[PDB]
Design a protein around this ligand. Structure first.
Ligand SMILES: [Mg+2]
Length: 275
């Protein structure tokens, strides 16, 4: 149902891509490593790799990671005492000017969900947004997270062009999932989460890189439940995004969905910028 087109490696002005960013919700760093996740990273060779749902504390990291050639500057965030839950990682070829953790709000900074890495010409944010939960029991909290995260990113974008990547835990529009009808009362497709995502795009402001380039392309998903043969049937959701400041749109080469890369219940996404 979906074939990601070939990589467009030049900006519209003809400038070659100089920066390749890869984002991937790994569904547990060790589970991902066993399913050959690293091998794929080596073939992809990104300049920056953002990982979500590492489920790993910084003191219990797999030794195979620090070894990664060309991704030697590594930063991790996990819940302090809570093992096997949430966790994000940012691995970079080049050293960032500054790395920070969280969104500057105590209530929202306890689950190791955000890493901010400032570079010379942009700020990179990687996030694992909180799921609205089974039966939507964490939806009110999710709406408070949405508001604090929008405010935080608006503050960052005012200082430097912003690239936000990661698992944002929302399929924005009906085109973003296989079954919009059956999912309006489920986490990831509630009107509340959809509205929050629309407000993030308008308030920062940010542009959805994949949708900017491919506005009518259906069946392009980044997550399929491990249950009910969803990935073989392409019953998926586009939960993973690259969101860019409008000033970075002339640097945008391509925004890829690496549908065939195995290793997780999510597939990786890749961004090419001519910075
Ligand atoms: Mg998971």
């Amino acid at each position: 149902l979906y074939e990601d087109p070939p990589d467009q490696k030049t900006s519209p002005s003809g400038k070659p891509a100089t920066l390749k960013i890869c984002s991937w919700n790994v569904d547990g760093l060790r589970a991902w490593i066993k399913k050959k996740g690293l091998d794929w990273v080596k073939e992809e060779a990104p300049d920056i790799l953002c990982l979500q749902e590492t489920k790993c504390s910084e003191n219990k990291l797999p030794a195979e990671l620090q070894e990664l050639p060309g991704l030697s500057h590594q930063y991790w965030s996990a819940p302090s005492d809570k093992e096997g839950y949430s966790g994000v990682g940012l691995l970079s070829r080049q050293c960032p000017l500054k790395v920070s953790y969280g969104i500057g709000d105590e209530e929202h900074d306890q689950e190791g969900r955000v890493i901010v890495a400032e570079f010379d010409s942009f700020v990179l944010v990687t996030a694992y947004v909180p799921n609205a939960g089974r039966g939507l029991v964490r939806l009110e909290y999710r709406q408070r997270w949405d508001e604090a995260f929008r405010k935080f990113l608006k503050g960052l974008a005012s200082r430097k062009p912003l690239v936000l990547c990661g698992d944002l835990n929302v399929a924005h529009e009906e085109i973003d999932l296989r079954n919009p009808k059956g999912n309006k009362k489920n986490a990831g497709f509630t009107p509340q989460e959809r509205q929050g995502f629309g407000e993030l795009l308008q308030a920062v402001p940010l542009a959805d890189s994949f949708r900017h380039l491919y506005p009518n392309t259906p069946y392009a998903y980044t997550f399929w439940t491990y249950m009910m043969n969803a990935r073989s049937k392409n019953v998926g959701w586009r939960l993973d995004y690259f969101l860019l400041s409008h000033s970075l749109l002339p640097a945008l080469c391509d925004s890829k969905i690496r549908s065939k890369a195995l290793g997780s219940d999510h597939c990786p996404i890749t961004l090419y910028l001519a910075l």
